[PDB]
């Protein structure tokens, strides 16, 4: 009954970011939508987290069904910011696509299908690798919002990676995964400190955003399945 009024207001939330959507796509202004599917991403985490408690294999499927959704949208929005040149809505779509990634694994996971666990970590990969070039072109720019918001991105792949190489019991997976979100997590903290030093609270706080999402993916894989999978120093 507490999953309820979660799975209720998760939907609600889902159907209210899809009409703002909706009205930004339509006002073409992407920032605005990409921030809107950032949303539906958010809400889309929240169902198939419920599916994953409640174990209900059909709901679960559904999550992955409006996560495929919103990250195809947001594919499309990636694709005209960068004829844009708009490197900020492109860091903004990639957090939706990355978001979205860790919604599929979450559900391959709790449904124990292997192939379509893997078909996530996959879309990780390739969102990371993006977003990696995302926060190298900001680093060099001098663009630490742009910068920051990659980050995030790269946090929630390596999250998503995590993911996956958990319930996958692939060792080789989760070392690769630990090794990406220690470097993230420094690269976050470092962003936040030097934001901090600038008074750039915005920054600080997008920058804490992508350390404490490295911190989880890192704790994740130390702590899977009674720390088999755990990085021994």
């Known amino acids: 009954e507490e999953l309820e009024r979660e799975s209720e207001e998760a939907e609600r939330r889902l159907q209210e970011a899809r009409k703002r959507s909706e009205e930004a796509r ?5 920032k605005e939508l990409a921030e809107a599917l950032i949303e539906e991403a958010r809400a889309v985490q929240e169902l198939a ?6 174990g209900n294999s059909e709901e679960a499927e559904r999550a992955s069904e409006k996560a495929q959704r919103v990250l195809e949208e ?3 929005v990636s694709e005209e910011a960068r004829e844009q040149g708009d490197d900020e809505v492109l860091a903004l779509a990639l957090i939706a696509i990355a978001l979205a990634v860790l919604a599929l694994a979450e559900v391959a996971c709790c449904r124990g299908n292997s192939e379509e666990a893997e078909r ?4 990780a990969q390739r969102v990371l690798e993006e977003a990696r070039k995302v926060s190298e072109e900001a680093r060099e720019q001098g663009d630490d ?3 920051a918001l990659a980050l995030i991105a790269i946090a929630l792949a390596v999250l998503a990676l995590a993911e996956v190489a958990c319930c996958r019991g692939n060792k080789e997976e989760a070392e690769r995964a630990y090794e990406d979100a220690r470097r993230v997590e420094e690269e976050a903290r470092k962003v936040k400190e030097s934001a901090e030093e600038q008074g750039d ?3 600080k706080r997008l920058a804490e955003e992508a350390e404490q999402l490295a911190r989880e993916a890192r704790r994740h894989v130390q702590e899977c399945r009674g720390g ?5 120093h």
């Open 74 to 76: 947001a594919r499309k």
């Open 201 to 203: 609270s915005e920054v």
């Open 49 to 54: 987290r419920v599916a994953c408690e409640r």
């Open 228 to 232: 088999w999978l755990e990085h021994h």
């Open 145 to 147: 919002e742009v910068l």
């Open 26 to 30: 339509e006002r073409g202004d992407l």
């Open 120 to 123: 996530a970590s996959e879309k």
